[PDB]
Design a binder for this molecule. Structure first.
Ligand code: EL5
Ligand code: EL5
Lengths: 491, 491
């Protein structure tokens, strides 16, 4: 049994079922004896009786086994063997991998139509010239939808706290939009994120399809079959009910890997059953790999441009500070300009126990309390929180205006601070979805609906701002050194 | 006892001795009763008999204790209290800190001459306009020598493996040069590096001075006095013998902290005894803090310029690759130009089982072996080692030419590689010292001499190149994506 209480620990890598669009044969390390097989091995390959115990050269035929063994030699990265001939002449696309000293063989009815390199080259050319992260993500959903013909294509970006944001969408006009919507970290368990990091590609042919059991589900020694790298691996019934509640019949997700971390997913949804042939899956995987590499470079360039711009801005200020006698007057005139360095909804100057504010800041009378707190915990270093009420309970009163704070000391001797503020994240939502869009539910309840996922997320981020990035804190530290530096020069 | 076998684990934070240029009094948490005192507390403060057991208000006087307690309130960061008046009118500079719920009070005969902020401002102004790491380090030794009047000023930079390099030097003409010399990691133990990370400043007044014991060395409960933050803490007899063998009578080291790590030391050596007054030590600490902050920014700018230049170079190449029909010919014509991206002593192209070399590369007949090894372990990612002979024993034969290798895959399908090489580090030495310079030794032996330190280091780095930096590998990865990317475009 699995319900909304234990699905966080569901062992989705050992379900003991495959999807019905193919058949699976498990063999020993050196592919000699057949240890396990899918019930539907009969229907597809046309073999009567039990396959377990019988030898590899017997069940498939000496011809094919020679080719499979030779390919295995050339690593848990599965080997693709498209359009292979069996004993009785039937044609199959074969996926072959070795994991936990068990050899797994997956059979699909052959396609042998579309060329895998040809499709991929066309798609990769149309994204290689993107000059921004925004330009790459926007065009990719549109492109994938047009090429693989899925009803909806989304990109999810994973936030610092594991939550997912829908950052791009291409869909049929009649479907509802999820663009700018968030889902909580719990909507994709840790063990699911582990498998998504191990498999570039993940297929669901039919959410309402009947799953085929693996025989035996557990062997003599009491071990289950690990289908971690098997493309036919069946899907959690919790996620199954989710897709059915949405009217999604089929899916295909591509893993976006950046700096060896799971950045997010390209996710294709279809409203009717749909399986891509092996050749099309090879092309989509190759596209996924290139999409990942290009985004990584664009992120690097973006971070780099941002730091360059901060260095330039700080030089401009240091050149001004040389020709102004009174530094305090310059800071009072200039402080608002520092909002160009770090994304913020407001900025403020606390100098000589006087307060100057710009944009969304806490109220005037709240500032002396904050200044005392900052001086207490700062210790002449940059201090930042995205949850000010967790540090100062009375800061909850003004969370809608300032939920997040980053503090920069501007003096080595006196307790003067440049303060950057952010509104609570729910205030900055640019969500575009039908708020009165209902979802039919199943046994588990209305928890498995986009509407309730979004509601749970919104609750989780109450009184919290967008977290300060590594790039934000790196710029804050360079600004601290510039300001402390020039403050020292001016006696 | 401590000898060259156990000095790696010497507990230098609890030596139970202070230096003779001041006296120490240990008190309880809330400075009520005197728990420990230095033997020389008598000579300096003019008090007869044992001080332990007697109350704080008694030994020092109710007047002074009020000021010390009040200052303690305003953190293991020691409080400076220059020119303080005792009971009988004597004048003392007082260092005051609280560590492990013990209050430690250090007394020096007062100076009250030089102004601490005035000296520091002058010094910091002369380094704030440095536009390169090289310009900052070079001018700092020269400046510190001229201002604090030490016979020799060195900067040591810590390598990845913990070894120290002398990267800058200002000295009296008659002294020998250590510029470009290395010392092994063992020459500064882990527990010493821990204290250098905790104390900005470290003084040795007289290496041949007589150490004053702390009474008691161990208390009732069996605890020693932790002098981690005490400026009078006595120095290891192993390091003492080292300085005497060099003809160094006094020292003062400043900790260079960059990204919260111990980057290195500014180290002042004097050939005669020398103690700086508290006011001069405050100024030197302040200079150290600013030197650290400026170097950190200059390192950031340098890393940033290097990555910018690589991006520019790769754009120039990608623009060329569009107008050339045959990519292989372009790579054969161009490969040597990629040596501008990553510091290397040679570079080579392995394409279609053909080899093209530039600069210091392994011999022609050795390359097919390397190409096979790289293809084996690479797995389509950047692979790098600074010790090629550790991975391929026969690579020892040509270590003088190529001890380090970084491999970049330039194809997704075929096993083609761009190879960058570095000579073994001893080949790239620009050392400027008298090789026939003898050192008088003590009980421990000739291990405690710069000559033997350098010899031990040279042995430790045999058959090894300068390690590939984080910036080197970041550029290699961006080059892999550029080259794999454009290789795919060209069918
Ligand atoms: C209690 C456990 C739950 C759970 C587990 C799993 N989710 C899995 C896949 C998956 N979940 C989501 C989440 C979405 N949330 C939305 O609001 C939404 C659409 C608007 C989606 C799609 C996503 C995005 C995915 C990835 C695939 C996809 O279709 O997008 C899985 C793994 C499935 C598998 O292939 O093995 C598990 C397990 N999901 C829950 O909602 C809960 C409560
Ligand atoms: C077995 C332990 C040893 C050891 C321990 C310690 N070294 C310490 C300080 C220290 N060592 C060096 C090394 C140098 N090597 C040189 O070749 C050289 C000059 C040419 C030097 C100076 C340095 C640089 C330092 C820092 C101070 C300095 O004077 O530069 C200490 C800590 C001393 C203290 O203040 O507590 C310990 C302990 N040193 C050895 O050589 C060995 C074998």
């Amino acid at each position: 049994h699995v319900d909304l209480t234990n699905c966080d620990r569901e062992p989705i890598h050992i379900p003991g079922y495959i999807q019905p669009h193919g058949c699976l044969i498990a063999c020993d390390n050196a592919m000699r004896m057949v240890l396990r097989h899918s019930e539907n091995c009969g229907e597809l390959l046309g073999l009567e009786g039990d396959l377990n115990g019988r030898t590899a050269e017997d069940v498939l035929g000496k011809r094919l086994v020679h080719d499979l063994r030779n390919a295995l030699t050339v690593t848990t990265r599965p080997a693709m063997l498209p359009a292979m001939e069996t004993s009785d002449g039937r044609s199959f696309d074969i996926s072959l991998h070795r994991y936990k000293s068990t050899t797994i063989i997956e059979f699909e009815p052959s396609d042998s139509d579309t060329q895998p390199l040809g499709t991929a080259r066309k798609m990769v050319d149309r994204i290689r010239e993107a000059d921004s992260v925004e330009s790459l993500i926007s065009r990719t959903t549109r492109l994938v939808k047009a090429t693989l013909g899925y009803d909806r294509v989304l990109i999810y970006r994973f936030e610092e706290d594991g939550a997912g944001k829908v950052v791009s969408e291409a869909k049929q006009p009649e479907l509802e939009s999820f663009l700018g919507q968030y889902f909580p970290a719990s909507d994709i368990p840790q063990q699911a994120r582990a498998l998504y990091l191990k498999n570039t590609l993940r297929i669901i042919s039919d959410a309402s399809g009947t799953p085929i059991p693996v025989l035996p589900a557990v062997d003599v020694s009491g071990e289950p079959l690990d289908l971690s790298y098997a493309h036919l691996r069946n899907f959690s019934p919790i996620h199954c009910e989710y897709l059915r509640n949405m009217g999604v019949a089929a899916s295909m997700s591509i893993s976006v890997i950046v700096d060896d971390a799971l950045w997010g997913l390209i996710v294709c949804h279809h409203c009717s059953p749909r399986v891509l042939s092996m050749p099309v899956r090879i092309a989509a995987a190759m596209f996924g790999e290139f999409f990942s590499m290009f985004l990584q470079v664009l992120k690097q360039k973006r971070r780099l441009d941002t730091i360059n711009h901060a260095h330039a801005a700080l030089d401009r200020f240091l050149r001004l500070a040389a020709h102004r006698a009174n530094l305090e007057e310059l800071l009072v005139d200039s402080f608002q300009d520092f909002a160009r360095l770090i994304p913020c909804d407001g900025v403020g100057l606390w100098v000589g126990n006087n307060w100057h504010g710009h944009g969304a800041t806490p109220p005037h009378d709240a500032i002396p309390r904050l200044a005392r707190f900052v001086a207490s915990v700062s210790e002449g270093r940059v201090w930042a929180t995205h949850a000010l009420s967790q540090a100062i309970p009375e800061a909850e009163i003004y969370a809608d205006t300032a939920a997040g704070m980053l503090a920069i000391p501007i003096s080595q001797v006196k307790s003067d601070y440049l303060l950057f503020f952010r509104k609570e994240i729910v205030q900055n939502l640019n969500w575009a979805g039908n708020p009165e869009k209902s979802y039919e539910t199943g046994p588990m309840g209305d928890r498995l609906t986009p509407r309730k996922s979004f509601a749970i997320w919104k609750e989780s981020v109450r009184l919290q701002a967008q977290p300060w990035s590594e790039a934000d804190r790196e710029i804050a530290e360079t600004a601290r050194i510039a300001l402390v530096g020039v403050a020292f020069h001016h006696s």
